[PDB]
Amino acid sequence: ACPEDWGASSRTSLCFKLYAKGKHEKKTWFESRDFCRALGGDLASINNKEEQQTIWRLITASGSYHKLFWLGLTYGSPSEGFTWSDGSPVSYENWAYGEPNNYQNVEYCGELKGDPTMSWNDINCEHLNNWICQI
């Protein structure tokens, strides 16, 4: 069962929470990771298409679209490439077309574009974004 406001009560329920913030309260990737970890969780990993649908439905209920959210995507070693901060394997992927492109060699964190495509992009880790936690 999920904590109240994070999802449903069944044993198979997965728990996510959107953090949409104004520009003075958006966070870098590391700040967002630390925020979710302080609650006992982490930035959201999206391990399969079922979790993608869960998050998309939360976005539809939010009223807003087109917002950029940090996910738990962070580059590891050159041989690893992208990893999830929660340690789970990056098996499922939904990178946007041409991504990750490491544009200008300075993009080591991953963001979700909260549109129907639900696509991922690598971007500068020091950008201030909204974020999604999991527990």
Ligand X SMILES: OC[C@H]1O[C@H](O)[C@@H](O)[C@@H](O)[C@@H]1O
Helix (H, G, I), strand (E, B) or coil at 32: helix
Give me the 98-127 binding string for ligand X, x by CB under 6 A, dash otherwise.
Answer: -x-x-x---x-------------xxx----
- Identify the bridge partners of residue 74 per DSSP, sorted by sequence position: 83, 109
Q: Quick check: 101 binds Ca ion (CB under 5 A)?
A: yes
Q: Quick check: 46 binds ligand X (CB under 6 A)?
A: no
The H or E element that residue 34 is part of is helix 29-38
Terminal-residue alpha carbon distance, the chain: 11
Give me the 74-103 binding string for ligand X, x by CB under 6 A, dash otherwise.
Answer: -------------------------x-x-x
Give me the 46-85 binding string for Ca ion, x by CB under 5 A, dash otherwise.
Answer: ----------------------------------------
User: In Å, how far are 15, 33, 66 from 24, measured between CA atoms?
Assistant: 26, 18, 19
Q: Which does 62 bind (CB under 5 to 8 A by kind): Ca ion, ligand X, none?
A: none
Q: Are 74 and 34 in contact (CB under 8 A)?
A: no
Q: Kindly list the residues in this chain that would bind Ca ion in the complex (CB under 5 A).
A: 101, 103, 107, 121-122
